[model samples]
Target: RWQRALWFAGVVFCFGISAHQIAMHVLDYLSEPVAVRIDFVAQNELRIPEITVCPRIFQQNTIFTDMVEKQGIDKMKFLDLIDRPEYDIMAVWNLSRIFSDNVSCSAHEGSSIISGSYVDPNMSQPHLVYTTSGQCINIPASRPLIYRGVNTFVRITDSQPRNLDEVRPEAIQIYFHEHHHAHLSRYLTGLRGYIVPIANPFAFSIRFTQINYANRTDSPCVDSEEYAACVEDFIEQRIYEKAQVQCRLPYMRPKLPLCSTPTDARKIFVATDDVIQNFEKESSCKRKCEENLYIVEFMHLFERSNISIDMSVYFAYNYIQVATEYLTYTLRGLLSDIGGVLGLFLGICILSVIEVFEVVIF
Candidate 1:
């Protein structure tokens, strides 16, 4: 009958249109599209991050002058003292004594915390971690610091000022981060001033963001400290043992220019680094998949005599905050998107799969 033929034509047209839409949706999804949606997330508590203060000139004036200048042992092995803790200890800035030294060793008037954001004396205690910049005075707050109107305050004054010379020392490098994280020069080094004397006041307005890198479990790795990344080479083995590195051959060059030639175990041609270049593959490192990064806005001040380096670190926004790196487009994404497109075109629910496919199979 002509009536039956008309019905068949109409069904074919509708089926063809539905097929076009669903197929287009699948293709688009296959292309792997992604977009970042930034939203502020509220949290009850936030972890307290540590701060590192590294003096560019890491030498005790008296000790270094005695050992190098007047005494003069072996200048070629001079850099070795850096690796030598006993002599290094004498040469490096002893933070504890440095603060308690010729300056205001007294409480109320000397190096004191005169304001908001209190850190536990023993809790936020500092660690003397060795770093390329110098011996870093790391301050990790054991207690969780809350959000407040006024920031945390700290004042370090060296009124008894003693020295400053050839070191032409710059400001102590200050950083806010987790202890294990720091590439130093290759990573983050902001804020400058010599503890020798700086009346400069620094106020940090902090923006904390979290980056979540999709775990590339592809190659299981272990992260190492600065001057570290395991490589396979003879020199690489020695660096791990001597300079404190994980790689068979880490970037062991004390200074970028000061390199020890692989041919010559000396300085500024190359040391253990050129050996690292052998394996193009970067040393295995499981960089934090989820880690908080800080963006500090300098709401800045400082100089000598009554030299006081004052700092206040506090959060800008309260209640809610969190910008995160996110990955989109996955099997689940495709599955859900297909459902949406099918519904729009055919007026069907996900359940339609059972009966709809049944009819198609027939």
Candidate 2:
């Protein structure tokens, strides 16, 4: 029974991860294309686009359904959601109304309403007066439509979004655009580059060399061939700086600024820098670092709080040892225990008869 419970828990954990991935994929699928218009294209200029992420009207109304029944119905705080620049979509509905007085009009015989009004004898007390009636109507009345999760476009001049909290919009945006950005691809390639040294460093280097040969001309480098070389150089510098920090244990301790930590500081700092560079080739790395220092600090605190040892190996070894001993003991018991075959047969027959009779039939 305990084993079954454990198995069920493991299944649930795996299912949760799968569900989250599916949710993200669904969001990605529904995403629409948005043009990132650039007003200027100087070599070092940066553009940060403003984005809006709005809840679908259908989704809002259904939010209080059975699953969310226990969840209190709190109206969405638009200000809180829009505080981040990453969400770019906005959605709203239009409503119009006409008072009963405005609904009806009159005119003298053989005269237009304007011409008849011109001949009116009374100025303040005319035959009719316009007043708003209580009947409210929607012009082009239509159900509220869902805006894209993201919509508005704005630009940031610095190389990274400041914090994960701050980068929510940027992360969502980059998550959509990174597939197209050459820099992020390079970053992922660089991350996987570590695996090669462990597997076959020489072969890895050779393959990379060939790739460089084929694409180096087009590959982003801090070479004179490209005017954005400076930006690339800046990115490379930040990458190296982060890598160095992550390699040291002491740098990962609490009370240290995240950039001071070797791992998270390096990852987030580099990721943010890359994002900044992707938007503005001329984005300032120094300013990016400064703007993101708080985020780096936050990450440092987060990492320190969550640090743990990988104890699974010891637990797994002990589990295997216990299982081996239990299996051996069970086999020994079966072999040593002497029960008459006639007795076992009688027991089984009795149990089977009882089981069949126990079922209730209408």
Candidate 3:
């Protein structure tokens, strides 16, 4: 009877062990190996690579100078002044036209004395040339003005006309671009002119402000100035939506965690939330004066397409190349194989100890 009891107990214990092992195997079978998603962000910060302000001053002077100088203001009489060590034929003529026009000049045009010293572009810090009469001046692109002159020259070839107050280094038009799997210098060289990514949306917004219908009759900045209030109301909505929908999609990598991606490929290529918000605010403000949504939308779509070209390559390697599948399979197999061995050893030791104690008691 005791033998039968021992045999029954052994069978029950073995059955329990088998059931436990089977259950574990079933769970493992049902579970899938999850691939780590590697998110890549490329921060293609936008900046103005080159800003050439071709103030119409040179052209305007050429036109007006031909008009006046030909009217018997002896090219020779002014030749000494024109040939004066400090005098520039172009600067002299532009200053003369403004003085003769006698328009209400802003501080940008307030005049000063012209230095008799000749300025070499290479040797001299660019200086703004001023008439001795304090009526006109030349603004040298190279020189630093203690204050910007009233005879300010601006080239507005595109978008809404900016207010005098809004024109500054920060206000300059910004271009944006992205690089992936390639060095930055190479990418820049290839797309130097038209296909750069924009970092600051404000710069793009400012550009939007400069667009015109080629007719001077239309008011400038109407889109940003007039509907500013309504635009503001919708600013948050649009920006948030863009972030949720458009901002981060280009950076996603299917196989690895966001943190593990390479720095070069993991840039924040799209504009930030702040930029979008500012744009919406500025655009809404100008809604009354102009409808700029059409222009803004066009550029936004264009930029997204540019980003997409690079992004397609990133996704292809991380998602579809099957590299992550192999990685996950290897990791999961190693862990389970190790766990099974350890569990088997523990189970054997437990059973051996139990059998020895039972024999001693018997």
Candidate 4:
């Protein structure tokens, strides 16, 4: 009786081992481990472009000298001291004078910024948008044409303008981004600005040379803010294409100016950090899993005649594009692997499975 019981226990142990291995394969599949494959496609695919230009400052120097000097206040100390009083906010922000207010934009005779959007003889202007870098212009155009010459150009000059006592270099910052994205240069790089020193005083061109990243939404990242968003991304879902939902911090900006000295600017931008942090928590904005990225090159003339900054924007080629896709351990593939493992360990193949059914029926 003891020998019979021992054999039954042995049989049960062998079955448990086989079941355990099969469970592991299934568990691994559920975990969603994946790999990405990079590839290219034709350049003919229609693509639109959005270009944003940021002027360095908006608060005028006249305001600076008048307030600080007239008050006999130390210039450095004055910035902090102005934090109190209703008049202070009214005077600086209500004048919430923006960089665009100080500058104007114009296109070359043959090229235009609004070309793709408008076909008629008359054209429209780019919409005005605000950013921490004061006011900037967002030029969103329809799908660009086939050729690679200068399609649109910009002329940026001061509106009889203005800075605080800092290493204030005359500079303009520009960013190339997707249309829906907020093209504020600061947020994308996790920094405030990237100054294209205007002292380079000349016309520069931005050309789309290479582009093709098609990321797939297969797995979540580890220790990524995006990963948290992906999981809690409130799958109770929508037709929303999973993509980077940018914090439109510009809109959340209080009716105040984002202008000042370097340290002062940092103080205010950080002061407003609550808004962005709250937004990220609420929106559950994940990183791009599906998109195209156009890598462009900036070439300067090492020249200039116009006392203003000029930008000639164009597409570099009528060539191929690339797309990267992420792959995962698919269900079908997992099944095949499980079959191979069981077949080697227990000789459990399709025929063996069928044989079991036949015996049961008999």
Model 2 CA deviation exceeding 4 Å by range? 1-181, 184-230, 242-362
lDDT per residue (tens digit) for residues 45-159 in model 2: 1112111111122123222121123233234322222213442111111100111122211111122346421121111111111101101111110111111111111111112
Across 1-362, the per-residue lDDT of candidate 3 in tens digits comes to 99999988887877677667756655554453444333233222211111211112222233334443654464223322333434443334343332221111111112346752122223111122222111222222232212222222111122222236322112111112121111111112212212222222211221111122211222323433334344433443443344443222111222232222222111222222344324634443432322221121122221222111110000001111111111233446655654564456345454676798999999
lDDT, candidate 3, equals 0.29
lDDT (C-alpha) at residue 179 in model 1: 48
Best by lDDT: 4
| TM-score for each of the candidates | 0.56, 0.15, 0.19, 0.58
Among all windows of 10 consecutive residues in model 3, the one with the lowest summed lDDT is 308-317
1 or 3, greater by TM-score: 1
- Candidate 4: misplaced stretches above 4 Å? 1-24, 45-48, 57-124, 147-169, 182-192, 199-270, 273-285, 291-296, 302-307, 317-325
lDDT of 1 by residue, 242-322 (tens): 444232111233422222222232331133334333324444435454556676666653222334344455554444444
Worst 10 residues of 4 by lDDT: 235-244
Q: Best-fitting candidate, measured by TM-score?
A: 4
What TM-score does structure 2 among the candidates reach? Answer: 0.15
